[PDB]
Amino acid sequence: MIMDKENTFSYKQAITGTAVSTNVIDLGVSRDIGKGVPVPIIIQVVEDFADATSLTATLQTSETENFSSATTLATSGAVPVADLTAGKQLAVQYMPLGTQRYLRVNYTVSGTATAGAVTAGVVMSHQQN
Amino acid sequence: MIMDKENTFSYKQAITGTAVSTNVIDLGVSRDIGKGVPVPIIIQVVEDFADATSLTATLQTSETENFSSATTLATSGAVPVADLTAGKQLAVQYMPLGTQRYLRVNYTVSGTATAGAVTAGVVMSHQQN
Amino acid sequence: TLGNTYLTLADVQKQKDGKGNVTSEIIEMLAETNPILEDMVVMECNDGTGHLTTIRTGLPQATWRRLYEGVQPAKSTTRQIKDSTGTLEAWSEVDEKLVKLSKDKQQLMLNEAAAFLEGMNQTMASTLFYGNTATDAVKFMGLAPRFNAYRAARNLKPVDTADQVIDAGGTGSDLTSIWMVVWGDRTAHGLYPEGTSAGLQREYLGAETKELGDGGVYRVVREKFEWDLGLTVRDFRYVVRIANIDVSDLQAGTIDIYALLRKAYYRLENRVITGGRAALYCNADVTEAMDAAATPTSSTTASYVRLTPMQVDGKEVMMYRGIPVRECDAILSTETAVPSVA
Amino acid sequence: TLGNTYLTLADVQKQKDGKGNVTSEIIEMLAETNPILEDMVVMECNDG
């Protein structure tokens, strides 16, 4: 993979607590980029989770820097910690449709965590097996 | 949309009342699809709907021909009644990862409508606009 | 329990004449004029997975650089939208012995070929003008479903698909629309899928065998007609639509057809500057209204045209503003009430 | 945050056809016509 810096939501972000993503990719124009030729994305969990219980991994999109009202484009559900190992993908392969203005990832966690990290972001080409 | 029989979940299937896809795909062996080359699918509503509260078109897979081991590859979610309109792509643009021997489409509707139809399957080139 | 599978004795007989030969003249009262099938451009889809188009949806915002000050670079923010094809195909087995028996082989086969060709042309035009995959799955996308929403309070030039539809009245069952499609390469064209031959195809397969399910066997001859295309309006800037035309009011003249037409050709905003071949499609009823407005009888209230005594007949409307107005038997006068985009 | 400043990878993916080559024919859909800059007369200030 040749995943790069700019269009990347989080780089090895712990989000051990109930945090959110840091690099909110913002686009001035509502391109809704998923249309036509696809764009691969990952929300692959990069390092294991110790004492969490659920890792709802929404892909909230909104129309303001601060996500006053956000819209969900991909939610992984209440994934139990038994699967939050390295390489555990948490959404669809390619870019979804409906990216209105802004894009930030939520990390609602049931309870806190003592370990856990992710590398959500856009990738030039997926890695499989 | 260049649909095709022998690779179609359901052709013009009516949705009214809880039911599954009329046709269940069978890929010979339990090998994978979503990986590698993208495979577009459209579980899309064709004809409008009625008093039914919601709809839950999920892409269930199972190793057995009859689906006793349910496995959600991708879910439409509880789409509200208002958005059950023609042309609504209810699930992911591309085929999710982890295809088993067989795949089905499960329609779980909150209540029963007097109208509603879906044509779901894999297309040669998903047509935008 | 049925006999309409193929051509039979009765059909060829009724296709004959009193002389005793297959006629070279069948009056096609179901024939139609379908000009859009002749004014369209067809180019191969050699882009893979259906033809793709690259809209530009933003441009940099340069800065006045006072000396010794830095300028932060920006980028061209593009966007993509792809299109797909859709195939039509018809077949005909005519019991090779039967066509052998009828004296005029070529004339009979030509009659059937013309019948199939005209029917498929009608279907092509109808779905080119109204085919909406969002309700029929397999078909391609026509110009109507891509525009079925109008900007109520139009904004000047934020050109969106809802910014190219002018509405006036409608809201009944007499609604119809008028079209303005620029037929050019980077305007709109017909995609035949890669490898697929261009345009309405025809394959005289010749003699076959037609093995039955009970051991029966007899020769047949099969002629196959195939056609697939997609219209792929690459820049909706080159297309504008006027919808909700109340046919009742249109003939009664309550609605001003020419005011709407002038609101077009300016929302069109193209071929007034640059572009390629243009056209204007509307059924017979609309052109009748335009000719009425050109040479008015006791037409409602006002027409602002004076005529001479000899200038009371009126020609056909023909080229409007230099755009050849073509009449097409596909724009139905029973359209759907195109709604406001709100 | 951001992602709007430099030419990111997503845009490059968007600017190519399915064959894997960069698109020669890009629909502008935002170009404007302004002949003020065309018919205007301009000459060097050539003074203090």
What does this protein structure show overall?
This is part of a larger assembly, with 2 copies of chain A (129 residues) and 2 copies of chain C. Chain A is mostly beta strands. Chain A has one domain. Chain A is 0% helix and 13% strand. Chain A contains no helices and 8 strands. Chain A has strands at 25-26, 41-42, 45-47, 61-62, 70-71, 102-103, 117-118, 121-122. In chain A, the strands form 3 sheets. Chain A has a 4-stranded antiparallel beta sheet with strand order 1-6-4-5, with no helix packed on it. Chain A is globular. By secondary structure, chain C is of the alpha/beta class. Chain C has one domain (1-342). Helices cover 20% and strands 16% of the residues of chain C. Chain C is built from 8 helices and 13 strands. In chain C, the strands form 6 sheets. Chain C has a 3-stranded antiparallel beta sheet, covered by helices on one side. In chain C, strands 1-7 form a two-stranded parallel ribbon. Chain C has a two-stranded antiparallel sheet with strand order 2-3. The termini of chain C are far apart. Chains in contact: A-B, A-C, A-D, B-C, C-D.
Question: Keywords for this structure?
Answer:
part of a larger assembly; 4 chains; A: 129 residues; four-stranded antiparallel sheet; two-stranded antiparallel ribbon; 8 strands; 13% strand; C: 342 residues; alpha/beta; three-stranded antiparallel sheet; virus; Bacteriophages; virus structure; Cryo-EM; marine podovirus
